[PDB]
Every structure is written in C-alpha cells, then in structure tokens.
Design a protein around this motif. Structure first.
Motif, PDB file in Angstrom:
ATOM      1  N   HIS A 635      48.177  30.334  41.279  1.00 59.62           N
ATOM      2  CA  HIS A 635      46.810  30.556  41.708  1.00 59.62           C
ATOM      3  C   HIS A 635      45.878  29.420  41.337  1.00 59.62           C
ATOM      4  O   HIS A 635      44.684  29.516  41.613  1.00 59.62           O
ATOM      5  CB  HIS A 635      46.290  31.857  41.122  1.00 59.62           C
ATOM      6  CG  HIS A 635      47.043  33.059  41.584  1.00 59.62           C
ATOM      7  ND1 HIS A 635      46.435  34.123  42.206  1.00 59.62           N
ATOM      8  CD2 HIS A 635      48.348  33.389  41.466  1.00 59.62           C
ATOM      9  CE1 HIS A 635      47.341  35.038  42.490  1.00 59.62           C
ATOM     10  NE2 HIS A 635      48.508  34.623  42.042  1.00 59.62           N
ATOM     11  N   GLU A 636      46.380  28.375  40.687  1.00 63.31           N
ATOM     12  CA  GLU A 636      45.588  27.216  40.292  1.00 63.31           C
ATOM     13  C   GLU A 636      45.860  25.986  41.137  1.00 63.31           C
ATOM     14  O   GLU A 636      44.931  25.237  41.450  1.00 63.31           O
ATOM     15  CB  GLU A 636      45.877  26.869  38.841  1.00 63.31           C
ATOM     16  CG  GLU A 636      45.635  27.985  37.868  1.00 63.31           C
ATOM     17  CD  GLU A 636      44.180  28.353  37.762  1.00 63.31           C
ATOM     18  OE1 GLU A 636      43.341  27.576  38.246  1.00 63.31           O
ATOM     19  OE2 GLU A 636      43.863  29.399  37.172  1.00 63.31           O
ATOM     20  N   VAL A 669      38.239  29.043  35.059  1.00 68.53           N
ATOM     21  CA  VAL A 669      37.367  30.201  34.948  1.00 68.53           C
ATOM     22  C   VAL A 669      37.097  30.745  36.336  1.00 68.53           C
ATOM     23  O   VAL A 669      36.947  29.976  37.289  1.00 68.53           O
ATOM     24  CB  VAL A 669      36.043  29.819  34.271  1.00 68.53           C
ATOM     25  CG1 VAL A 669      36.307  28.948  33.085  1.00 68.53           C
ATOM     26  CG2 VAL A 669      35.163  29.118  35.235  1.00 68.53           C
ATOM     27  N   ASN A 670      37.030  32.065  36.461  1.00 70.47           N
ATOM     28  CA  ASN A 670      36.762  32.648  37.759  1.00 70.47           C
ATOM     29  C   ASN A 670      35.274  32.585  38.034  1.00 70.47           C
ATOM     30  O   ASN A 670      34.454  32.797  37.146  1.00 70.47           O
ATOM     31  CB  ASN A 670      37.244  34.088  37.826  1.00 70.47           C
ATOM     32  CG  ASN A 670      38.724  34.205  37.634  1.00 70.47           C
ATOM     33  OD1 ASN A 670      39.460  33.256  37.861  1.00 70.47           O
ATOM     34  ND2 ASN A 670      39.180  35.378  37.239  1.00 70.47           N
ATOM     35  N   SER A 677      42.963  37.781  39.370  1.00 73.34           N
ATOM     36  CA  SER A 677      43.191  38.495  38.124  1.00 73.34           C
ATOM     37  C   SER A 677      44.674  38.735  37.907  1.00 73.34           C
ATOM     38  O   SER A 677      45.441  38.842  38.859  1.00 73.34           O
ATOM     39  CB  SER A 677      42.455  39.815  38.136  1.00 73.34           C
ATOM     40  OG  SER A 677      41.143  39.628  38.621  1.00 73.34           O
ATOM     41  N   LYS A 678      45.070  38.845  36.639  1.00 72.28           N
ATOM     42  CA  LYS A 678      46.459  39.162  36.336  1.00 72.28           C
ATOM     43  C   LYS A 678      46.815  40.583  36.714  1.00 72.28           C
ATOM     44  O   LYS A 678      47.998  40.884  36.880  1.00 72.28           O
ATOM     45  CB  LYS A 678      46.779  38.997  34.856  1.00 72.28           C
ATOM     46  CG  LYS A 678      46.514  37.640  34.282  1.00 72.28           C
ATOM     47  CD  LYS A 678      46.754  37.631  32.780  1.00 72.28           C
ATOM     48  CE  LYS A 678      45.728  38.444  32.009  1.00 72.28           C
ATOM     49  NZ  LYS A 678      45.881  38.283  30.535  1.00 72.28           N
ATOM     50  N   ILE A 684      43.300  36.729  46.428  1.00 74.35           N
ATOM     51  CA  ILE A 684      42.427  35.614  46.107  1.00 74.35           C
ATOM     52  C   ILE A 684      41.105  35.932  46.764  1.00 74.35           C
ATOM     53  O   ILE A 684      41.065  36.193  47.965  1.00 74.35           O
ATOM     54  CB  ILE A 684      42.963  34.278  46.646  1.00 74.35           C
ATOM     55  CG1 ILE A 684      44.343  33.933  46.103  1.00 74.35           C
ATOM     56  CG2 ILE A 684      42.018  33.181  46.319  1.00 74.35           C
ATOM     57  CD1 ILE A 684      44.380  33.606  44.677  1.00 74.35           C
ATOM     58  N   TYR A 685      40.034  35.937  46.001  1.00 73.20           N
ATOM     59  CA  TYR A 685      38.732  36.311  46.525  1.00 73.20           C
ATOM     60  C   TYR A 685      37.901  35.060  46.721  1.00 73.20           C
ATOM     61  O   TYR A 685      37.556  34.392  45.747  1.00 73.20           O
ATOM     62  CB  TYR A 685      38.036  37.269  45.574  1.00 73.20           C
ATOM     63  CG  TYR A 685      38.606  38.649  45.605  1.00 73.20           C
ATOM     64  CD1 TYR A 685      38.175  39.584  46.514  1.00 73.20           C
ATOM     65  CD2 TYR A 685      39.593  39.011  44.721  1.00 73.20           C
ATOM     66  CE1 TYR A 685      38.705  40.837  46.531  1.00 73.20           C
ATOM     67  CE2 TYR A 685      40.126  40.261  44.735  1.00 73.20           C
ATOM     68  CZ  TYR A 685      39.681  41.164  45.640  1.00 73.20           C
ATOM     69  OH  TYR A 685      40.225  42.415  45.636  1.00 73.20           O
ATOM     70  N   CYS A 686      37.527  34.777  47.962  1.00 73.68           N
ATOM     71  CA  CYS A 686      36.680  33.637  48.276  1.00 73.68           C
ATOM     72  C   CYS A 686      35.428  34.157  48.953  1.00 73.68           C
ATOM     73  O   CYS A 686      35.505  34.773  50.016  1.00 73.68           O
ATOM     74  CB  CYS A 686      37.396  32.649  49.189  1.00 73.68           C
ATOM     75  SG  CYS A 686      38.889  31.971  48.500  1.00 73.68           S
ATOM     76  N   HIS A 687      34.282  33.933  48.326  1.00 69.81           N
ATOM     77  CA  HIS A 687      33.015  34.389  48.870  1.00 69.81           C
ATOM     78  C   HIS A 687      33.071  35.874  49.191  1.00 69.81           C
ATOM     79  O   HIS A 687      32.484  36.338  50.165  1.00 69.81           O
ATOM     80  CB  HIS A 687      32.604  33.571  50.086  1.00 69.81           C
ATOM     81  CG  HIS A 687      32.417  32.119  49.787  1.00 69.81           C
ATOM     82  ND1 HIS A 687      33.392  31.178  50.022  1.00 69.81           N
ATOM     83  CD2 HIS A 687      31.364  31.450  49.267  1.00 69.81           C
ATOM     84  CE1 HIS A 687      32.948  29.990  49.658  1.00 69.81           C
ATOM     85  NE2 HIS A 687      31.720  30.127  49.197  1.00 69.81           N
ATOM     86  N   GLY A 688      33.798  36.622  48.375  1.00 65.37           N
ATOM     87  CA  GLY A 688      33.975  38.050  48.551  1.00 65.37           C
ATOM     88  C   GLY A 688      35.117  38.426  49.451  1.00 65.37           C
ATOM     89  O   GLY A 688      35.811  39.406  49.187  1.00 65.37           O
ATOM     90  N   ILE A 689      35.365  37.639  50.496  1.00 72.02           N
ATOM     91  CA  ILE A 689      36.477  37.945  51.375  1.00 72.02           C
ATOM     92  C   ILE A 689      37.740  37.908  50.547  1.00 72.02           C
ATOM     93  O   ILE A 689      37.825  37.192  49.549  1.00 72.02           O
ATOM     94  CB  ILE A 689      36.569  36.947  52.537  1.00 72.02           C
ATOM     95  CG1 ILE A 689      35.285  36.931  53.355  1.00 72.02           C
ATOM     96  CG2 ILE A 689      37.729  37.297  53.407  1.00 72.02           C
ATOM     97  CD1 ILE A 689      34.897  38.251  53.916  1.00 72.02           C
TER      98      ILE A 689
END
Lengths: 772, 51, 89
Positions: A635-636, A669-670, A677-678, A684-689
């Motif tokens: 996720h990084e 950092v999120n 989240s683990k 994966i949350y981008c701009h809420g989507i």
C-alpha cells in the motif's frame, strides 16, 4: 505425529474388513451424511420422568476415561464415588460416572490458560446483557393496551446475510484447510472474514460450538407476535418486560443498538439513485442498474456494496422495491399506493377501461378492476380493512388512533378504488397542464387526484364529501365517522365504521418474481402495479456520510481531484498477474522497471513541476529499499510510484509530496488524499472514493492464503503438474500449474493467472445483440 | 418558611411537591430529624410563616 | 530584528521616512527619498512578492513556503494580527 500414524493404522485395519471396504468404495463422499443417521438412533417419550428416575441412580452419567486419567481425577475422593471402570453400551470408549464428579472437576480440576474468548463465542447474548444495562426504567401503569399482531424481527443484527453466505463463512474462519473454492461472497467481503478470523485463531476451542454460534450471530429472528408501540429490534427482544394486555412498564430505550438509522440511510441512497436514473428518457433501466452496481457504503466497520445490501434487506418501501426489481431480486407480495401500504387478502379481477372529462369535454382513459377484492391498508398509526367492487368502495372499517390519519387513509382508499363521481367527472381546478408529462412522461389519473389532494386540505374535504353523508342511525352513534374524523356525530359518512383497536396485519410467506417497464413501474404477472416513481417524495437535499458514488454522473468533484483519483485507479489495475505487472517485477527485484511503467507516465503531468526532481530522489529511495530486501508494504509503493518518473536531484525534502493542485500525500501517515488500514487491507481511500486492490500478492500485513485467491484459476486438469498444499501455494510462479485438494473428496488443477472479466457484461452485451 | 418538603416513592419515579403551609398536614411522613425539628415549632406557625 | 515589521531597536514609518528610530532615539538620513522606500513588495519575504489581498488564498507558515509553486497565491502573517498575500518571484 504419532496420532497421524495411529489414524493410518486404523484405516488399514478397517480396510482389511470386507463390508467396510465395500462401503468406503462405492459412491461419493456424500454418503457420510447418510451413514450418520443409521447409527446411534434412540429417543424417549417423557424425558422429565426419565431424568428424575435416572439421576436417582449411582452412576447415571457417561464420561471419557483417558481424559479422566490424564486429569488424574481419582475415584472415591471422600467416601463419595466419582466413577468406575466399565463400558457404556453405545460408545464403548466411555465409562460410567456420577454427577458429583462434575462438581469435583469444577472445584479442583484442570484449568485452561484463559477463557475470555467466551465473550466472543457468545457475542449476541453478551450484547443483550449490555444493551439491557443501559435502560432507564420508569413507573409502572395499568390500562388496556392496543396490541396489533404482525411479523417483526427480534434480534438486532448487523450485516444480515443469507444462509449460503454463512455456511462458507463458517469455513474460512474455522476450517480453512478444508475450505472450498473461493466464492464471490468471500472475495468481496474480505475484511469481514479477516475480522471473524482474528478472534478464533490460535485459541483452545470446541469448533462445532463456535460454528453454531456464528449462525446465531447472523440471524434476524422473525416472529409473528402481538406488538405495541415503536418497532425496533431492541424492544422486541425484551417485549415481555415492557407490557401486556393490561399494564405498561414505561422505560426509555431510544438510544441503543442504532439499527433503523442504517435502514433509513439505505432508503435515502436508493431514492437518490432512483430519481437520478429517472432523469433519463430511454435507458432508465440500464442507467439505474449501472448507478446501483457503481456504489458502495460503510456499515459499522466494514465496507459493503450497495447491490449486496439491497438483496439482503426487507424494507417494503416503494424505493427499495424498484431497486430489488432491477437487480432481479425476488420480493414479497405487498403493494404500495403513494404513502399508504396495502396487502390483498382475497378476491380477484382484471383490468377494464373507462374515460373521464377533465374540463368540458376532454376524454381521458383511466383503468379500473372488474371484480370484488379485499384489502388491508396501513397509513401512519391507522389501519383499515376495506373492499372494492367494480369501481366502487363497497365497505371499509378503520382502527386508527388519530383524526388526521383516519381522514387521509379513507381518502387514499377512495382514490385507490376509483370510488366517486370525480372519477366520473373531474373537478374544474385540474387542467390539462396539471394532467401529466412533467417532461413527456404521462401520469395516470389516479396519481393526478392523489397530488390534487396532497396540494390543499380543501381538496381533501371535497373528496370526502364525494362520499355519501347521512344521518347517524341509533346505536351506531359510536361506530360512525364525521368529516373531521370524530368517533361519533349526528351525521356521518356513508358505509364507514370506526373502532378502537388496530387490525391484524395479514401474513403470507410467499415470494414473487416481478419485472418493470421503461418508466420504472413494476408489474406482477398481471396489470397490477406494485411500485412506481410517482409514489415517492418529490425531492430533498441530504449529506451522505461514508458513501462512495464512484460513477461520473453521481459526482461533484472537479476535474483535478478526479484526475488524481483516476490515475490511482489505473495504477492499481496494473496490480494483476502476468509479467510486466508490478507483482512479477517485485518478485524478480526489478525495481528499475517500475519507474518506466506507462501508468506513472500518465500521472506525471500532475506532479508539482517546480520540485519534481526532489521528490523523485526520495521516492526512488523508498522503492529500492523496500524491493531489494523483501519487507515491503504493498500500500506504499502504490502511493509513491507516481513521483519516481523524473530524474533525481538535490534539495530539502520537507516530508510531504505535493501534486499540482495543492493536494499532497505524505509517506507513512494517512491523510485525506490516500488512506488505508490494517483492519481492512483491501481498500484504498482517495478523496473519499474507495478503490479495491486485487488479491494477487500478500505483503507482511496480509497473512494467509486469503490474499492469493484472486490470482489463481482453474484449468484443464493435468496429471503432470505437481501436487502441493495450501501453504506452499505462495511459492508458485505466475503462469504455472499445480494440483491441489479442494474442500472434501475433490482434486483440481490451478494456474496462477487471473481473469478480470465477469459474466454480467459477456451476457448482457451478447443478449442485446440478439434483439435486432 | 422557605419552600416545603417533597415526597417520593421508593424508586423515585414519582414525586409530590408540597408547600410550607401544608407541612403540618403530612407530619406523619417526614423523617425523624425533620419531624423533631418541626413539632416543637408547630405552635408558632400561622399559615406558612413562623412568629 | 525582523523585516517588514517595526521594533524598538529599529523602526520607521511613512510620512516620516526621513527618520529612523533606535530605542526611541530618532536619527536622520543624510539623503532624501520619497519613493526609494515606497517599494517594499520584496522586503517582506525572500523569494516572494506581495500582491492584492484575497481571502480565498490559504494561510501558510514560513516552513511550507518551500513547497509552493508559481501562480499560487498564499496568505501569511507579517506581524501581530497582520496578514498579507504573497506570490512567488
């Protein structure tokens, strides 16, 4: 270990016999179930009698023998017997014992390390207890109670599922080695499985018990009960201590279990998409299905797909009905005419045509039913039982509790039955403009009169006057209804009766498969309409929390954040199987080929141009550092890769990596732009989507074969490929084959290549190419 | 005399309120400490005041 | 001492530009100026220049300045309760 060898010896001895060999050879494995019944079958008539007569013995219980020796449970502790060497007749590997022995164990027996796991095994009942403690009782009062009978749910339950979706969930959490092929419910609800799995792993447990308890944790217990007051699972679970026929234990129980809030949220979303799709003129059907499947929502902790919640709910509302209809979901036989609710008890009929003159002479067709029918009807806090006969409201009885509700229910029933002269000669107030076709879509005369009533109260008064008014005969004074909705008067309406005491909602455990038209009006194997788009509220503005309308039409963001989000989506879709994708490159430690992907090249224009060099240095560092060793976080990379496209340079790295629209991501950092989240590692949350990462490879966080299932697939069976377990399944190479054992009595061959296509499109498209 | 005492049932779900003029009417209910502090003065009370 | 602001050690103001206060001690300038000082658009920050006020522009600190771009207005405190807008170059 030695036990394994013992099992092997046992199987050999058993095969040496002749009948056992034949029975273990013929048929498939399913026979096990059958054999499980022919053995150990014995019942008793009056178990109470035999319990008082059995416990009166010396050694009435059976128990294991080896478990007692290993626990060093003696016999004759203090001149009181505990057990004796014998063999029960049925088991043959158990020994008689006494009840006192149980107490002995509980007081001076072997102790397990910990038992707080119990609170999880029995979550539902500790949940009852907790909700109870937070109730504030009140005085007790005496009076008669109006208890209506009806079907309700007694178990507060989050994420109500089906039965097929549980029998599998009980496997991936408890018996994973014996698990079957991954079903869609699993691949979609990954975080849920991970959650149930984290608690019951590496624990001493009896698993049959745990499995049964999971079935109970996901069941809304539906019952047909007498009921009073609000309807909420929190009350229905303790209704026995809130009121009977003659008393009421007042208590406030409003702020607990938060169930109906989720349901009202769901209905709000459904109304939104239904209206949106209605905005179209020729594709409201396909538009609506697309809007549905392109949406998601949060439930408590987990993320669920809308189309999955809609096929699980039971809200009989004119909105949920349409959606469940578009998705081919079967449903109950409940009607709906505007705000009221309806349900047919008996009778029949068939459509018939008639006409009415709006102003002067303007013929307008409206239909009615040519037969007698009987109906239950329900408006807010008011019930009714009525009958229609060939375009007439024959009789009606009411059992509500308010005058306003009584008048409105009676009026909507009169409309529903085309009773009156207005359906014979419409009023002057209505005109051809008010007739229909907001933008071309006609409106049957019924809903015309409906809105004409909802417009002004005086229209409602006039409509009631359309019903005959007469003088209240003697005796019937109590069972009569005026125009105001008064339980008695000197002159009342015609063929109407009132009463105190609601009417019992009918019941039928039936299901029907309905369909719908291009105007979003559902039909049921007949010309009757069960739902539509004219019977729901006009419009309202609402701010939905924890929702994802990742579809263009349902979006308000600007092109900038949308461009960033689409870049991230495209960059993740390259996370599949096959060479040239990032998993293969990581496996080969080709950290260089990642910088040259085309996807980063499409996101490159978005980077801050005045510092694109500095970020590049830092970005590449992280990637190489993670890839060379092997301790990476999937996720990084997906987060920092878009910055590695340009050439490194020198400068001071503040700690954040900015895009060209003053929106940044920080590595570690999120934040609002990129979060995860683990707990639920598949989002994966981008701009809420929300964005769904495929399950092809598993990093340090993801810790099971659950993370590999979207990378394998079945292929023609090949006896040459090797046979492995489910744990070595991670060491195969993309594009290779391997045999494997699945579930029980089944062997197959898998190939580590994915196939993102589904069946929905391959079926719909080819179908539409046939209607030509 | 200020505001009168209040009555209540065991669970405290119901609560009656009485003024000063009526405390001489329910003396049998008030607590001991409150009763022994009220009877010796009952002579001097007139309506709701104390002479 | 701090640029773009006044202080006891060093202070000055327009309408008296011929004077420079030092702990209140007014000192004189051997020259005369009416515009040589009027252009302070570059005396506040290092690589920025003041521009017309705009509330839409976001507040920032002196550290984040490194990651700003061009054509990107930004507000910033220039003193006690004194906010002003800046633009790169």
């Amino acid at each position: 270990m030695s036990l394994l060898l013992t099992i092997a010896k046992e199987y050999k001895r058993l095969c040496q016999d002749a009948k056992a060999a034949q029975m273990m050879t013929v048929g498939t494995v399913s026979n096990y179930t059958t054999f499980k019944k022919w053995t150990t079958s014995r019942k008793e008539k009056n178990p109470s009698l035999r319990m008082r007569w059995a416990m009166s013995s010396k050694f009435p219980i059976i128990a294991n023998k080896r478990m007692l020796e290993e626990a060093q449970i003696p016999k004759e502790h203090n001149n009181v017997a505990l057990w004796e060497d014998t063999e029960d007749v049925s088991k043959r590997d158990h020994v008689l014992a006494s009840a006192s022995c149980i107490n002995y164990w509980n007081f001076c027996g072997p102790c397990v390390n910990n038992s707080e796991v119990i609170k999880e095994v029995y979550k539902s009942r500790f949940g009852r207890l907790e909700r109870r403690k937070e109730i504030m009782w009140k005085e007790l009062r005496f009076t008669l109670v109006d208890r209506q009978r009806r079907r309700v749910d007694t178990q507060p339950v989050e994420q109500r599922l089906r039965t097929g979706e549980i029998k599998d969930l009980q496997m991936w959490t408890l018996f994973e080695d014996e698990a079957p092929l991954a079903s869609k419910f699993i691949l979609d609800n990954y975080g849920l499985v991970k959650e149930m799995r984290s608690k019951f792993a590496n624990k001493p447990l009896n698993k049959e018990v745990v499995a049964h308890m999971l079935e109970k944790q996901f069941n809304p217990e539906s019952r047909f009960l007498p009921v009073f007051g609000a309807i909420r699972p929190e009350r229905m679970e303790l209704i026995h201590a809130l009121g009977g026929e003659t008393w009421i234990q007042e208590a406030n129980t409003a702020g607990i279990s938060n169930v109906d809030q989720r349901k009202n949220d769901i209905r709000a979303v459904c109304r939104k998409v239904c209206l949106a799709a209605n905005a179209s003129i020729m594709n409201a059907k396909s538009k609506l299905v697309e809007y549905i499947k392109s949406t998601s929502m949060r439930i408590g902790e987990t993320e669920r797909k809308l189309e999955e919640l809609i096929l699980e709910t039971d809200d009989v509302s004119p909105e949920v009905t349409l959606c469940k209809s578009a998705l081919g979901g079967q449903l109950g036989k409940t009607l709906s005419f505007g705000p009221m609710l309806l349900k047919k008890i008996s009778g029949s009929g068939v459509k018939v045509k008639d006409t009415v003159y709006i102003q002067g002479v303007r013929a307008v067709q409206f239909e009615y039913w040519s037969e007698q029918e009987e109906f239950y009807g329900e408006y807010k806090s008011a019930t009714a039982l009525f009958s229609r006969k060939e375009r007439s409201l024959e009789w009606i009885t009411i059992g509500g509790g308010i005058n306003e509700d009584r008048k409105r229910l009676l009026a909507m029933c009169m409309i529903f039955c085309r009773d009156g002269d207005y359906f014979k000669d419409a009023p002057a107030t209505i005109t051809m403009a008010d007739l229909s076709t907001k933008l071309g879509r006609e409106i049957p005369y019924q809903y015309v009169m409906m809105n004409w009533i909802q417009k002004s109260e005086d229209n409602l008064e006039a409509l009631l006057y359309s019903r005959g008014i007469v003088e209240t005969n003697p005796g019937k004074m109590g069972s009569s209804m005026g125009i105001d909705g008064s339980k008695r008067a000197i002159k009342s309406l015609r063929a109407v009766t009132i009463q105190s005491g609601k009417i019992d909602m009918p019941e039928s455990k039936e299901k029907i498969h309905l369909e719908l038209s291009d105007n979003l009006e559902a039909f049921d194997s007949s010309g009757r309409i069960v739902a539509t788009i004219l019977d729901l509220p006009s419009d309202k503005k609402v701010t939905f929390q924890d929702v994802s309308f990742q579809h263009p039409d349902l979006a308000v963001l600007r092109d900038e954040k949308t461009a960033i989000t689409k870049g991230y989506e495209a960059l993740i879709k390259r996370l599949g199987t096959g060479d040239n994708d990032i998993p293969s490159l990581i496996a080969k430690k080709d950290y260089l080929s990642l910088y040259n992907l085309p996807e980063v090249k499409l996101m490159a224009p978005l980077i801050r141009p005045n510092r694109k060099g500095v970020y590049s240095r830092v970005a590449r560092k992280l990637v190489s550092t993670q890839v060379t060793t092997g301790h990476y976080s999937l996720h990084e990379l997906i987060k920092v890769l878009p910055f590695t496209y340009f050439a490194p340079k020198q400068g001071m790295f503040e700690g954040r990596l900015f895009f060209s629209n003053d929106s940044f991501v920080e590595p570690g950092v999120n934040n609002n732009v990129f979060s995860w989240s683990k707990a639920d590692s598949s989002k994966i949350y981008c701009h809420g989507i929300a964005i769904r990462v495929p399950l092809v490879v598993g990093d340090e966080h993801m810790d099971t074969s659950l993370a590999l299932l979207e990378g394998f697939s079945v292929c023609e069976n090949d006896p040459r490929a090797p046979m492995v377990t489910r744990q070595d399944l991670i060491d195969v190479g993309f594009g290779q084959k391997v045999r494997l054992f699945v579930g029980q009595g089944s062997v197959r061959t898998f190939k580590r290549t994915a196939s993102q296509r589904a069946a929905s499109s391959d079926v719909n498209k080819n179908v539409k190419k046939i209607k030509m | 005399l200020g505001q009168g005492i209040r009555l209540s049932n065991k669970r405290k779900t119901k609560e009656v309120i009485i003024k000063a003029e009526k405390m001489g009417k329910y003396k049998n209910l008030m607590r001991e400490e409150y009763k022994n502090l009220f009877e010796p003065l009952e002579k001097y009370i007139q309506k709701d005041v104390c002479f």
